[PDB]
Design a protein around this ligand. Sequence first.
Ligand code: HEM
Ligand SMILES: [Kr]
Ligand SMILES: [Kr]
Ligand SMILES: [Kr]
Ligand SMILES: [Kr]
Ligand SMILES: [Kr]
Ligand SMILES: [Kr]
Ligand SMILES: [Kr]
Ligand SMILES: [Kr]
Ligand SMILES: [Kr]
Ligand SMILES: [Kr]
Ligand SMILES: [Kr]
Ligand SMILES: [Kr]
Ligand SMILES: [Kr]
Ligand SMILES: [Kr]
Length: 148
Amino acid sequence: RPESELIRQSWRVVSRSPLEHGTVLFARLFALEPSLLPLFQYNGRQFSSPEDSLSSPEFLDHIRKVMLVIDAAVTNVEDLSSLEEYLTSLGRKHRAVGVRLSSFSTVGESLLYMLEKSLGPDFTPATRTAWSRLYGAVVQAMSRGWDG
Ligand code: HEM
Ligand SMILES: [Kr]
Ligand SMILES: [Kr]
Ligand SMILES: [Kr]
Ligand SMILES: [Kr]
Ligand SMILES: [Kr]
Ligand SMILES: [Kr]
Ligand SMILES: [Kr]
Ligand SMILES: [Kr]
Ligand SMILES: [Kr]
Ligand SMILES: [Kr]
Ligand SMILES: [Kr]
Ligand SMILES: [Kr]
Ligand SMILES: [Kr]
Ligand SMILES: [Kr]
């Protein structure tokens, strides 16, 4: 496809500073849905405020984990079927930690936000539509983790 090249080219500039960019994604996320904050229980403790998460090594490690999973999607953009199995698993895990399926829509908007802000004039509506499709496919696979 040509959309596959839109994803690859758009990902390049972001992927080289994954923590800085994933920090924008999570900051947006908590701004849209603050009820996600408590889902991150390290040492059984809850973050009071969004800025509390950004001082947590474990939370920042999770940022990196996310950016890695996106990087895998980008890699396999032409053939997403290879990640299905892993993603179904990742969904069940998130079911178990307490994430509701509906929160993945917020996540996706947060991803689109972060790309928009990074790319500026380069984040064309085709680029947006390309990412929305890819994220779509990711969440489809992950939502098999809520039984079916
Ligand atoms: C509402 C959004 C999310 C919440 C509340 C959440 C929360 C968590 C928690 C609590 C863990 C276990 C603790 C940890 O390893 O840090 C976890 C693990 C993980 N999450 Fe998320 N997460 C979310 C979204 C995502 C997204 C969108 C991805 C990937 C694109 C992702 C990838 C991961 C990975 C890769 C792990 C490690 C799983 C394992 O191997 O056990 N998470 N997440
Ligand atoms: Kr992220
Ligand atoms: Kr954050
Ligand atoms: Kr924040
Ligand atoms: Kr990454
Ligand atoms: Kr991955
Ligand atoms: Kr992985
Ligand atoms: Kr993702
Ligand atoms: Kr998983
Ligand atoms: Kr999880
Ligand atoms: Kr996320
Ligand atoms: Kr994401
Ligand atoms: Kr997206
Ligand atoms: Kr994605
Ligand atoms: Kr996928």
